[PDB]
Design a binder for this molecule. Structure first.
Ligand SMILES: [Mg+2]
Ligand SMILES: [Mg+2]
Lengths: 119, 218, 56, 110, 122
RNA sequence: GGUUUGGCACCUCGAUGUCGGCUCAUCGCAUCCUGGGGCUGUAGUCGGUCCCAAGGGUUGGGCUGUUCGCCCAUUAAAGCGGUACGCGAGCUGGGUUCAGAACGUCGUGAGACAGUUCGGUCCCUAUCCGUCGUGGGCGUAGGAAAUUUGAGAGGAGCUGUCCUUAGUACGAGAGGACCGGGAUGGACAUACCUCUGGUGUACCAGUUGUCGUGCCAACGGCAUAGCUGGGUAGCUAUGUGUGGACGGGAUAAGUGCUGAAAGCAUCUAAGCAUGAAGCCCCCCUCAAGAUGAGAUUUCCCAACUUCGGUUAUAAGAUCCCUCAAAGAUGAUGAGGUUAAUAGGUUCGAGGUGGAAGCAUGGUGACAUGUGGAGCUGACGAAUACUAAUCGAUCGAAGACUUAAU
């Protein structure tokens, strides 16, 4: 367990970060939030290997109701993408891809920043 | 007279033969070994130098206590022994026994025997007065503002100093402790586990230390 | 509440034997030929933590 | 079960079978042993099992009678050699596992 | 746990129905009490008739406590209420009946006249 | 004696804030309880008086602003006092020393009490000392890791009931012992969560209104965590255990032995013993910055001719990083690819308590089966898939003088 913020706002912040990282496959953040969203998104790639309806009814909670995506002028929803695409790369592997890179600090707040990716 | 080391792992339930529930501590005397024998001839006191956890051989480019610096290895090669992490002594023992470099297996102990123990206490930070010492808090309402703080230190414009023995917020934890007059329940040599009535100052996987009681009644 | 006395030029300085700051970790790059800080990224050229795995 | 695998292995002996396996909401005649006055006797207690907590020897239940208008509820460790025998009679149906809604005499377990 | 200014029911043929716990005899300023512990009580109401009256003050012996006792076998017990019984240092009551069952550990304190009467020793 | 009511007017008027209570205690002994004793108009139990002794303990409530005091019910006892009638840069602010109003009164009157009464603003971000905890630097004639002695200091120090000895001793009887042994509890102090129960905001389930996911279904957001019922780890007291001891050394009051000065008697001057919870020693803890800087085991062991000295390195530790059994920060500890340190995965415990969908029975609300189902934060093993990469820093080459081989 770990605290960035209050209860609610933390949670929604994590549905947000984890909603991203798949839209973009990597982001730049402070280290702490990357650790927590790592745990989450690890659990979601563990989910999207199974692929049952119920699995969608568990990825529904955390991930958002929609966030549109276009690669080839295509319509996706960050859910179709997950169970349809992502896990189909890392089936032969366990969950637990995500890696972290202690990039550098930040002039404003002195906070360490990183580049967490699933690529 | 005797004594060993061990590790608090956990507490459980266990029944007497009259049906009396009896609480219990678990302790593990795994890999106890004697290393060195400190005579009065040289040092000025007769005692026994001991070791508990097997650790590993010399470094090559290596690092912390999982492995072993040379001098430890220089001490454990001595009596045909593997290097050990926790070393502790035991005075008040029949030093005529315990040749340098053997084991102190649980069989020295026996059910029914009485013992004390020793161990570090638990982690606790800057704790306020009433949690460190058990002082009594102050009023809530009726308008007060003195809820928890330690009260008036001292006397007056005379007796200006503040005496040393007062009671203030400092750490609460790390302390050697002893718990006289516990009893033993059982000795399972299979897992090399022992069981001790009552409860002991320790955290899980912490250090625990034992010896035969002194205040038997004599 | 307040000071009663003037804090002299000595104690104001002895008090400041600890506002120094530590020599940060440093080491040359493995194939970016320059210094950076340990268990971190280079910020250059192509990123070199074990070699390039990034652009920025 | 494992908490550490050293505790579990050595507490093995105090464990025992002859335990009717069930769920809360059971009427239950507990034929229990007693000694006092040096009289080697037994008793019998009845009622509804509120609780069943804990794994291992710590395991436990809690029963309940309403003798003489006065509520009573007793809780034993499960594996006591101070118990002789157990008899489940009925078997209940409930949407709770802990039963602390129990108060006065409209409490039909159904 | 039973203590000062605690109101209880009763069990006997008194003419009284509830009491008040002034003091909780023992040691040097005990605060508490449980099963078996004699106490010094008074009377805050009454059903009509019966020997005892309002304003009276007498001892009592606690039984039917709501945070029951731990038996050394590792078994516990819990009632719902609190109660007491009136007494005269015969360690035998005034009353003629006992409603409301009893807790047995009274027996260690050598009380048997009320244990003769109680459904049931429990 | 200098705790009271007083006398004095020596500090204080460019401010020394006063009563009482809360938290905190600390001390004296002219002892309130326990311990030991002497005397007795002490038969015994209970007692009265005097002596030694301050090691510990010395309660809840009613009543008033209350010291005081009366009372209830307990208790072994419910001490007397000092510390700005302890403590307000720690708290209260009920009376009293502000303004309003009013009652009796005195005054021709404004207004004032010998008084009474309803109400009435309490600031201070701690520089120094002191104190509680805790890290750096240097030193202890080379450098390191471990263990440990313990001059000193601190802490603990309380006590009832009951069975027996013995219904014996004692006394006519009523009544009713020392001594000693034995179990059992109060309060207090420490340690812990296996139990009892508490909390437990990324666990579980039910559920009200509303908005959204294009709709039904199933979900999410918000509303004190929206409320309600449970509740793992962890933290916890009312829970769980444990403890004060036993014992010895020297002692005061006191009791003696031998014995003179003083042929006797004489406890004392020469001498010998004896004797309290008191002193000390033992019990728990800290502790070599005890500058008297300790002792033991083990380890590292060059080249440069400045001769004195210099060097990058050796053993080792750190910088850096993952993390808790530790944590305000720093420190301590587990660990760093020649690896299970943390995460994740797979198992498991425990917890919640019958997922979704599907079918079936229902006009439906809903039930049954599929199924001790699904879910699961901290707990337990295994699993290198990811993250502790490559690396740099610091650190000796052992002064002299005697006396030893
Ligand atoms: Mg009243
Ligand atoms: Mg619990």
């Amino acid at each position: 367990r770990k605290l960035g913020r209050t209860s609610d706002q933390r949670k929604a912040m994590l549905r947000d970060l984890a909603t991203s990282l798949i839209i973009s496959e990597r982001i730049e953040t402070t280290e702490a939030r990357a650790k927590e969203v790592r745990s989450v998104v690890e659990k979601l790639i563990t989910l999207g290997k199974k692929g049952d309806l119920a699995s969608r009814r568990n990825a529904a909670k955390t991930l958002r109701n929609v966030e549109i995506l276009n690669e080839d002028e295509t319509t996706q929803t960050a859910l179709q993408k997950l169970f349809g695409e992502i896990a189909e790369r890392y089936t032969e592997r366990q969950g637990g891809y995500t890696r972290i890179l202690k990039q550098g600090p930040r002039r404003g707040d002195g906070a360490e920043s990183v580049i967490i990716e699933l690529v | 007279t005797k004594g060993i080391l061990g590790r608090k792992i956990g507490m459980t339930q266990v029944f007497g033969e009259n049906g009396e529930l009896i609480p219990v501590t678990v302790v593990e005397a795994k890999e106890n070994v004697v290393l060195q024998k400190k005579t009065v001839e040289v040092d000025g006191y007769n005692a026994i130098q001991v070791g508990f956890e097997d650790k590993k051989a010399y470094k090559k480019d290596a690092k912390s206590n999982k492995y072993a610096n040379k001098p430890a290895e220089g001490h454990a090669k001595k009596a045909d022994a593997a290097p050990k992490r926790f070393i502790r002594e035991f005075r008040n023992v029949d030093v005529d026994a315990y040749e340098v470099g053997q084991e102190v297996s649980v069989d020295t102990f026996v059910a029914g025997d009485v013992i004390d123990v020793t161990g570090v206490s638990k982690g606790k930070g800057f704790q306020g007065a009433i949690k460190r010492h058990g002082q009594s808090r102050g009023p809530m309402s009726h308008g007060s503002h003195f809820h928890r703080a330690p009260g008036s230190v001292g006397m007056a414009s005379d007796a200006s100093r503040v005496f040393k023995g007062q009671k203030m917020p400092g750490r609460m934890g790390g302390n050697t402790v002893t718990v006289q007059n516990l009893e033993v329940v059982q000795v399972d040599t299979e897992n090399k586990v022992i069981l001790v009535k009552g409860n002991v100052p320790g955290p899980k996987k912490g250090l625990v230390e034992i010896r035969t009681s002194i205040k038997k009644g004599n | 509440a307040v000071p009663k006395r003037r804090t002299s030029k000595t104690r104001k300085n002895k008090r400041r034997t600890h506002f120094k700051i530590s020599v940060p970790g440093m080491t040359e790059c493995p194939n970016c030929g320059r210094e950076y800080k340990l268990s971190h990224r280079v910020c250059k050229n192509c990123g070199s933590y074990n070699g390039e795995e990034v652009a920025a | 079960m494992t908490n550490h695998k050293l505790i579990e292995a050595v507490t093995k002996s105090q464990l025992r079978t002859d335990l009717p396996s069930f769920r809360p909401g059971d009427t239950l005649r507990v034929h229990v042993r007693i000694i006092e006055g040096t009289r080697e006797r037994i008793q019998v207690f009845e009622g509804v099992v509120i609780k069943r907590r804990g794994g291992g020897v710590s395991e436990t239940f809690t029963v309940r009678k309403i003798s003489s208008g006065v509520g009573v509820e007793r809780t034993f460790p499960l594996h006591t050699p101070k118990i002789e025998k157990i008899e489940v009679k009925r078997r209940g149906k409930v949407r709770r596992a802990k039963l602390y809604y129990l108060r006065s005499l409209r409490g039909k377990a159904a | 746990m039973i203590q000062q200014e605690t109101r209880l029911k009763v069990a006997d043929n008194s003419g009284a129905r509830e009491v008040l716990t002034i003091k909780v005899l023992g040691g040097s300023g005990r605060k508490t009490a449980n099963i078996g512990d004699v106490i010094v009580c008074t009377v805050k109401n009454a059903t009509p008739g019966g020997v005892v009256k309002k304003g009276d003050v007498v001892k009592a012996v606690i039984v039917r406590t709501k945070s029951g006792v731990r038996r050394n076998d590792g078994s516990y017990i819990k009632f719902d209420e609190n109660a007491c019984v009136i007494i005269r240092d015969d360690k035998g009551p005034r009353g003629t009946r006992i409603f409301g069952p009893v807790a047995r550990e009274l027996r260690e304190g050598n009380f048997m006249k009320i244990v003769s009467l109680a459904p049931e020793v429990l």
